[PDB]
Design a protein around this nucleic acid. Structure first.
Ligand SMILES: [Mg+2]
Ligand SMILES: [Mg+2]
Ligand SMILES: [Mg+2]
Ligand SMILES: [Mg+2]
Ligand SMILES: [Mg+2]
Ligand SMILES: [Mg+2]
Ligand SMILES: [Mg+2]
Ligand SMILES: [Mg+2]
Ligand SMILES: [Mg+2]
Ligand SMILES: [Mg+2]
Ligand SMILES: [Mg+2]
Ligand SMILES: [Mg+2]
Ligand SMILES: [Mg+2]
Ligand SMILES: [Mg+2]
Ligand SMILES: [Mg+2]
Ligand SMILES: [Mg+2]
Ligand SMILES: [Mg+2]
Ligand SMILES: [Mg+2]
Ligand SMILES: [Mg+2]
Ligand SMILES: [Mg+2]
Ligand SMILES: [Mg+2]
Ligand SMILES: [Mg+2]
Ligand SMILES: [Mg+2]
Ligand SMILES: [Mg+2]
Ligand SMILES: [Mg+2]
Ligand SMILES: [Mg+2]
Ligand SMILES: [Mg+2]
Ligand SMILES: [Mg+2]
Ligand SMILES: [Mg+2]
Ligand SMILES: [Mg+2]
Ligand SMILES: [Mg+2]
Ligand SMILES: [Mg+2]
Ligand SMILES: [Mg+2]
Ligand SMILES: [Mg+2]
Ligand SMILES: [Mg+2]
Ligand SMILES: [Mg+2]
Ligand SMILES: [Mg+2]
Ligand SMILES: [Mg+2]
Ligand SMILES: [Mg+2]
Ligand SMILES: [Mg+2]
Ligand SMILES: [Mg+2]
Ligand SMILES: [Mg+2]
Ligand SMILES: [Mg+2]
Ligand SMILES: [Mg+2]
Ligand SMILES: [Mg+2]
Ligand SMILES: [Mg+2]
Ligand SMILES: [Mg+2]
Ligand SMILES: [Mg+2]
Ligand SMILES: [Mg+2]
Ligand SMILES: [Mg+2]
Ligand SMILES: [Mg+2]
Ligand SMILES: [Mg+2]
Ligand SMILES: [Mg+2]
Ligand SMILES: [Mg+2]
Ligand SMILES: [Mg+2]
Ligand SMILES: [Mg+2]
Ligand SMILES: [Mg+2]
Ligand SMILES: [Mg+2]
Ligand SMILES: [Mg+2]
Ligand SMILES: [Mg+2]
Ligand SMILES: [Mg+2]
Ligand SMILES: [Mg+2]
Ligand SMILES: [Mg+2]
Ligand SMILES: [Mg+2]
Ligand SMILES: [Mg+2]
Ligand SMILES: [Mg+2]
Ligand SMILES: [Mg+2]
Ligand SMILES: [Mg+2]
Ligand SMILES: [Mg+2]
Ligand SMILES: [Mg+2]
Ligand SMILES: [Mg+2]
Ligand SMILES: [Mg+2]
Ligand SMILES: [Mg+2]
Ligand SMILES: [Mg+2]
Ligand SMILES: [Mg+2]
Ligand SMILES: [Mg+2]
Ligand SMILES: [Mg+2]
Ligand SMILES: [Mg+2]
Ligand SMILES: [Mg+2]
Ligand SMILES: [Mg+2]
Lengths: 209, 145, 63, 124
RNA sequence: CGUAGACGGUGAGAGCCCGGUACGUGAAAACCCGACGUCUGUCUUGAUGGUGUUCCCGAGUAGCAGCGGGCCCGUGGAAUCUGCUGUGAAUCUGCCGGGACCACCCGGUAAGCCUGAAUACUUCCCAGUGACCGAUAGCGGAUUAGUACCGUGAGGGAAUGGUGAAAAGUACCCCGGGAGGGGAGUGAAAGAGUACCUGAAACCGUGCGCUUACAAUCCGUCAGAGCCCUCGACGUGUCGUGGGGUGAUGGCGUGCCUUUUGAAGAAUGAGCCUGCGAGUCAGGGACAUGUCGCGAGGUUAACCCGGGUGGGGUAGCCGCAGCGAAAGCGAGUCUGAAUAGGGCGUAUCCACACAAGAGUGUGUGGUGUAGUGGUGUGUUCUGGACCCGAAGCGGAGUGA
RNA sequence: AAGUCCAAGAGUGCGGCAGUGAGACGGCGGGGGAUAAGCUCCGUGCGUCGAGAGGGAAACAGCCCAGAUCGCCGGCUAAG
RNA sequence: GGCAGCCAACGUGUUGGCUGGGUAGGGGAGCGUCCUGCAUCCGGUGAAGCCGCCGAGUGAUCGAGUGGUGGAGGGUGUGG
């Protein structure tokens, strides 16, 4: 039920945005969103790790020597695991690491993280990052500094607004994401989440029905 | 303000894997297999009994046939109509699917298990005699499709 | 790959409404003349499988 | 994620080899033979830690018996009389008395003999 | 400074030192694309729906049979498709199919031919990425690598990276035939000297401390004299809550592992060190148990839109009613002639009655019924499936 | 009917995970053998070893005593 | 005198009582290695590795205690 003031790059405010409590006042669920972020990073894991088993390494077809009478260990090929240059036994092969959590688990984790930010006044709405027609990291940085003192911020902007995302892209602690792409991992990174009026309205309207 | 390092699995969620054959402190030199035999290196199939006639071979096959032309019905008991419809009214198959009493595309037969008290107009593929008596003795009417 | 049901056991075993697995008694397919009818009728219908065999039959049935 | 198992492997090696100093032969040089010796060493240390309390009691009894027989009394009668008299000094300090100052041992033998039956072979 | 805080290099962690990055700009020629014309072709000596018959509608084909192949279908009652052999029709009130077959109905129009897209792959080229390896690893191949080498031949098939920031790579002198060193210099360092980062262990010496040549030793452990070193105190050498080294001597004492009723065993294995070498992974698999979300519901699969891990996707799947071989009936149902017993089913509990104490039943009320989807663990199924090991079997080749 | 009952860590039922299915000697009851075997085959709310350390039997898995949580330079005992 | 497992009492961390040999095997809780998300800290005034000294823990082991060597990366917390 929070009422976040919308703030303009001039240092002023225009109005306020109502945050529905079914969407920004949810009790957080540490275990649930632990599972959600762990599944997220599992999907990010490029599992491109591979070895060669006993039969994939080069050579090894021959039996190295006679099986009896030589006074030596019985050896079936030179590519056996115990050999130098031999095959790896239970070694890595490529894996897909994504796991498919239910939709409402993901949605609830989103709402819980955003509620966690809202309870502590870490959600901001702004008309836009910088006055348009041209990117400017200097002025957008100054405005964002007035807006917050913390290190990491999410900057949730609509996809069409390129001048804004360009002017905030090169700040070291700033992460830019689209409202329809919002996930629990990026909002838990951020100390503050800085919406735009359009992006806040868009996220509200995508969950208003 | 919960951050990514404040996240933790629920107590009792994650159990440690049992790494076996990693010393005599836990499970070593046999990895819980005991000494030699068939079972010391491979397995035994579940349908093996030692060469005596297995359980699935000394017993008769169940009598009968399957009747591929079976007409199966998804069944509602009359007592659920009370809960689903506090006032009664017209109740077809598809406004009975919305209440989650049957599956979406199937043949529906109504059975008379509970007790029906409201004025209802039931339409269904088939009815029970007890169900029909309950429908009409409570003041409603029932028609097949 | 998806598990395979053991076909020879499915045509021999069946589950009831609660979930107990039933059976068919043996020694009733031929050589019937010398068997009294009391033995013949104590040998028909279903009977629940033993608790000792319930573990393997379950694995054969579910595959 | 391949591990090179040498950081962890060397730790117990250094422990056992440092414990095996002074061992004659290759039981102080090779980790395997030193480990085999450490097994016996710690079992022997347990065994002898348990039996040291019996070895020292043996030594105290021997010293007490010699001192008592110098005082013209048997060991067994001496401790029987000390039990009868209620003087309840253990064999350790009774051996320190036998060695360090024999006059107190003589007096204590006097007490033990004074507190002893007029017939030690009497049917009672 | 930032539309550039990607990544490298530079004498050690560089957005502002270099190459670059963000962002823009550039092609004479060749090639790949479209687009507009010549060009090419066709249609218009011509259109349209009617009214009534004869001809035509893919022939050594269909069908039929024998022997096979393949279909979920292993010859079965065996259709559909199909090869070899034999026999061998009709042109539409025909012919084929609808799991032997027949009748009726329905669907279609074989024995003529072309056909894009959605689908499979990567020798090669470009650009990237990795909770991938990091020199016994990763390709066999970071270096002469399919090389050296082994084989007549098919073929088999290695080992070898690191000076320093920069060669500044030791001028000159001395011993030595040289090799090697010692001074001197270079260098931050030469405990960096082209035998070169770090430089472990096995193994090999040299110096010092204690001990050991009348002694039967799984080589230790417990007690222990003497000597040596060290830390305190008082003092000036002897104790002390001491600590180390070595040990004359005394008690006790039969290696480790495998496998066995039982091994110190004269059963197996192991010369030593260092590096390596064995329960792993896939799957809406199955069963059980934790944990989480939603809950009489739970969840999507392919797929579509997102430079992402996000959002849509109801097809299906599991729960929701059972009994029966089945037709079927349904809180019942099957058997049976049976309101006559039994089987299975009606979550579970509570009470009040009505009947028998042959194990309690029946009925009226009440309470109301729990699943599913992620994910951890154990076991399991299909896969080389914890790792190693035959003699041998098959295919194609190489050799007198 | 009691006992044990801050324990036997006891029964029974359901389930998850097993290993085992080569036993040895000694006491008592027996078959085979020659009323031989450190033989072989059975019975035993018999024991110990297996899977048991410590004390005794000179040494000596299976005999006697006694069941090792650790420490002590305390005491009392068991078989002997 | 120290530890631990089961249970009980007040009560909410203590105390008490019983118990703590063990192979196949079952269960529980942990040590050390490496790679990583997030958070912090250390490091050419010298990281890692190695060699020691002096210590520590019930065990695997530890030493953000110290020296020698060394020359560029490491520690810790909480998850994967
Ligand atoms: Mg091969
Ligand atoms: Mg040999
Ligand atoms: Mg082979
Ligand atoms: Mg390799
Ligand atoms: Mg999705
Ligand atoms: Mg796993
Ligand atoms: Mg073991
Ligand atoms: Mg072992
Ligand atoms: Mg097991
Ligand atoms: Mg074995
Ligand atoms: Mg065996
Ligand atoms: Mg076995
Ligand atoms: Mg199978
Ligand atoms: Mg047979
Ligand atoms: Mg089947
Ligand atoms: Mg019959
Ligand atoms: Mg009959
Ligand atoms: Mg010594
Ligand atoms: Mg950089
Ligand atoms: Mg035709
Ligand atoms: Mg066929
Ligand atoms: Mg056929
Ligand atoms: Mg074609
Ligand atoms: Mg290599
Ligand atoms: Mg190296
Ligand atoms: Mg190689
Ligand atoms: Mg040649
Ligand atoms: Mg100099
Ligand atoms: Mg140096
Ligand atoms: Mg060298
Ligand atoms: Mg070097
Ligand atoms: Mg001498
Ligand atoms: Mg002797
Ligand atoms: Mg000795
Ligand atoms: Mg001896
Ligand atoms: Mg053998
Ligand atoms: Mg053996
Ligand atoms: Mg034998
Ligand atoms: Mg041997
Ligand atoms: Mg020998
Ligand atoms: Mg053998
Ligand atoms: Mg040997
Ligand atoms: Mg190797
Ligand atoms: Mg799996
Ligand atoms: Mg059925
Ligand atoms: Mg009948
Ligand atoms: Mg009945
Ligand atoms: Mg649940
Ligand atoms: Mg599970
Ligand atoms: Mg061959
Ligand atoms: Mg030839
Ligand atoms: Mg009792
Ligand atoms: Mg007990
Ligand atoms: Mg028990
Ligand atoms: Mg057997
Ligand atoms: Mg047997
Ligand atoms: Mg026996
Ligand atoms: Mg015998
Ligand atoms: Mg006898
Ligand atoms: Mg006999
Ligand atoms: Mg015998
Ligand atoms: Mg016996
Ligand atoms: Mg055994
Ligand atoms: Mg013993
Ligand atoms: Mg025993
Ligand atoms: Mg006795
Ligand atoms: Mg006494
Ligand atoms: Mg006695
Ligand atoms: Mg206690
Ligand atoms: Mg124990
Ligand atoms: Mg005990
Ligand atoms: Mg064990
Ligand atoms: Mg470490
Ligand atoms: Mg970490
Ligand atoms: Mg720093
Ligand atoms: Mg320096
Ligand atoms: Mg490292
Ligand atoms: Mg230094
Ligand atoms: Mg250091
Ligand atoms: Mg972990």
């Amino acid at each position: 039920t929070l009422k976040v003031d919308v703030k303009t790059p001039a240092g002023k405010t225009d109005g306020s945005v109502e945050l529905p409590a079914e969407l920004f006042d949810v009790e957080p669920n540490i275990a649930l969103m632990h599972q959600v972020v762990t599944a997220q990073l599992a999907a990010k894991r490029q599992g491109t790790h591979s070895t060669k088993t006993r039969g994939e390494v080069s050579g090894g077809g021959k039996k190295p020597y006679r099986q009896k009478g030589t006074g030596r260990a019985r050896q079936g090929s030179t590519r056996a695991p115990q050999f130098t240059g031999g095959g790896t036994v239970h070694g890595p092969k490529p894996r897909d690491y994504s796991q498919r959590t239910p939709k409402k688990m993901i949605a609830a984790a989103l709402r819980g993280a955003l509620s966690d930010r809202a309870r502590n006044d870490r959600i901001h709405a702004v008309t836009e990052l910088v006055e348009g027609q041209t990117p400017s990291t200097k002025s957008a940085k100054t405005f964002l500094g007035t807006l917050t003192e913390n290190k990491k911020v999410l900057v949730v902007i609509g996809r069409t607004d390129e001048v804004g995302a360009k002017s905030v892209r090169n700040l070291p602690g700033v992460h830019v994401i689209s409202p329809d792409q919002l996930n629990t991992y990026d909002v838990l990174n951020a100390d503050d989440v800085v919406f735009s009026v359009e992006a806040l309205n868009a996220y509200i309207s995508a969950n208003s029905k | 303000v919960i951050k990514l390092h404040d996240l933790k699995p629920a107590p009792g969620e994650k159990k440690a894997k049992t790494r076996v054959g990693r010393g005599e402190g836990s499970k070593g030199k046999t990895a819980g297999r005991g000494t030699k035999g068939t079972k010391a290196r491979k397995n035994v199939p579940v349908m093996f009994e030692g060469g005596q006639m297995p359980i699935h071979m000394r017993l008769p096959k169940l009598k009968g046939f399957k009747n591929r032309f079976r007409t199966e019905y998804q069944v509602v008991n009359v007592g659920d109509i009370n809960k689903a419809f506090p006032q009664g009214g017209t109740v077809g198959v598809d406004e009975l699917v919305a209440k989650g009493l049957v599956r979406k595309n199937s043949l529906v037969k109504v059975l008379g298990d509970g007790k029906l008290t409201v004025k209802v107009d039931v339409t269904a593929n088939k009815f029970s005699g007890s169900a029909r008596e309950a429908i009409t003795a409570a003041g409603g009417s029932a028609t097949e499709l | 790959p998806k598990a395979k049901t053991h076909s020879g056991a499915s045509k021999r075993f069946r589950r009831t409404g609660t979930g107990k697995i039933v059976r068919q008694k043996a020694n009733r397919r031929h050589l019937l003349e010398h068997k009294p009818t009391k033995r013949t009728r104590r040998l028909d219908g279903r009977t629940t499988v033993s608790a000792a065999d319930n573990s393997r039959i379950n694995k054969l049935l579910n595959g | 994620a391949r591990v090179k198992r040498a950081l962890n492997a060397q730790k117990k090696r250094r422990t056992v080899l440092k414990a095996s100093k002074g061992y004659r032969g290759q039981r102080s040089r090779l980790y395997r033979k030193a480990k085999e010796q450490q097994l016996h060493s710690l079992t022997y240390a347990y065994r002898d830690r348990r039996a040291r309390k019996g070895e020292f009691r043996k030594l105290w009894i021997s010293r007490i018996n010699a001192a008592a027989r110098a005082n013209d009394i048997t060991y067994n009668r001496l401790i029987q009389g000390l039990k009868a008299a209620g003087v309840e000094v253990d064999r350790k300090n009774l051996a320190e008395l036998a060695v360090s100052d024999p006059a107190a041992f003589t007096a204590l033998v006097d007490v033990a003999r004074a507190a002893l039956p007029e017939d030690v072979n009497a049917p009672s």
